[PDB]
Design a protein around this ligand. Structure first.
Ligand code: GSH
Ligand code: ZN
Length: 405
């Protein structure tokens, strides 16, 4: 491309005035409940997009059942719709999509987004929502008996171990009961730790940073294939890291990555990388923030939170992506940043920015954006932009899908 020098080339000049009490009124009240007039627009655009999406999937690859770009992804969207809208046509649609995604298993990856973890974990909860334990319990055992498959697997989101964790947490979250024994989550989380300190020695960070992780011959900073993603998961009460192991091991590793940030506030794609232009959830501030906020939650130190703000100001400035409107690397996925901040801070400035990003999404296709490689997919495509819009309806429950927790 021509746009290789800096963030500003990748992005659109943000045209929206920044928050004040007055402008927020149009979007939400002092309770941060969205004006029905606004929910109405969001919700009309959702119905409108869903039509195009549904027509689009007719020509989508029958072969791909990934969360990331295939049917299981769409199943995910619909289960989230059936939740936000009660409309049982969504639970039907979801059923047809997990049906489809279960003919796509290749037994060759273990993550929610790119491997059999997606179709299985999603089919599990769907079959549950349909009062149908026969298959619910059947998918469970196949999700579990996935473990022994890539024993030398990586650690990150898309192919790594946290990616398989999420699939398990997703099931448990959606049953409420602990259907996957805690010990089985503990199994895998152990080996991700012991392997992150080994790597850290062999390479000699273990002084500068007790833990280290890599994938595809790089140390990945960000959320998709990276440290930020992996640490975020380790600071996660659901994983249960010893209060000591949390301070001894993970805290300084985290701090190492913080130290990594560009002057701009952004974060390098890769360790040693010094091209400052990716504002994606997959690479940069918009994915790094989840770690920062989760760190402020558990260590309660003003620097973590002060970085999150710093993330957000960058995303606010450079998050409207020429890339398009998707979750992995697009305006929708970027907006989720703001919601996560907002849900911690409660500072209405952030719920506002999220809304103003939705304002952009509502002009889907009006900007010159290249259409995504898979135009209707959860993560590169329309299904994701839609996902956000629906999630935004009720901010406090908004979670970046297939990841956030
Ligand atoms: N397949 C994607 C294109 C992926 C592209 O946006 N690159 C992603 C890969 S996860 C990101 O790493 N961007 C790299 C860059 O912009 O240099 C689509 O067409 O929607
Ligand atoms: Zn990406």
């Amino acid at each position: 491309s021509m746009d290789i020098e800096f963030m500003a080339q990748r992005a659109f000049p943000n045209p929206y005035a920044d928050y004040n009490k007055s402008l927020a009124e149009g979007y939400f009240d002092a309770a941060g409940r969205l004006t029905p007039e606004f929910s109405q627009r969001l919700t009309n655009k959702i119905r409108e997009l869903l039509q195009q999406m549904e027509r689009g999937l007719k020509s989508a690859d029958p072969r791909d059942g990934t969360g990331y770009t295939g049917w299981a992804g769409i199943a995910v969207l619909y289960l989230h719709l059936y939740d936000v809208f009660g409309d049982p046509a969504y639970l039907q649609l979801a059923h047809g999509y997990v049906k489809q995604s279960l003919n796509c298993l290749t037994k060759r990856s273990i993550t929610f987004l790119c491997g059999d973890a997606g179709p299985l974990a999603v089919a599990a909860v769907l079959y549950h929502k349909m009062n149908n334990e026969k298959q619910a319990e059947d998918c469970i055992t196949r999700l579990i008996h996935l473990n022994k498959i890539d024993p030398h697997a990586p650690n990150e989101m898309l192919y790594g171990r946290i990616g398989y964790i999420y699939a398990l947490l997703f099931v448990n979250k959606n049953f409420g009961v602990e259907k996957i024994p805690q010990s089985h989550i503990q199994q895998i989380c152990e080996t991700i730790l012991t392997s992150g300190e080994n790597l850290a020695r062999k390479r000699n960070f273990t002084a500068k940073s007790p833990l280290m992780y890599e994938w595809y011959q790089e140390y990945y900073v960000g959320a998709a294939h990276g440290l930020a993603g992996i640490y975020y998961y380790l600071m996660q009460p659901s994983l249960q890291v010893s209060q000591g192991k949390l301070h001894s091991l993970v805290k300084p590793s985290v701090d190492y990555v913080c130290q990594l940030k560009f002057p701009s506030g952004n974060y390098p794609p890769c360790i040693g990388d010094n091209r400052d232009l990716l504002v994606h959830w997959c690479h940069g501030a918009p994915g790094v923030i989840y770690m920062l906020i989760q760190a402020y939650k558990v260590f309660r130190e003003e620097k973590y939170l002060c970085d999150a703000y710093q993330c957000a100001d960058v995303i606010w400035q450079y998050g409207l992506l020429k890339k398009g409107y998707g979750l992995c690397h697009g305006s929708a996925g970027n907006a989720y940043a703001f919601l996560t901040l907002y849900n911690l801070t409660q500072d209405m400035k952030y719920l506002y920015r999220a809304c103003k990003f939705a304002e952009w999404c509502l002009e889907y296709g009006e900007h010159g954006c290249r259409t995504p490689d898979t135009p209707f997919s959860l993560f590169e495509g329309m299904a994701g932009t839609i996902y956000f819009l629906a999630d935004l309806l009720v901010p406090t429950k908004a979670r970046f899908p297939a990841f956030e927790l």
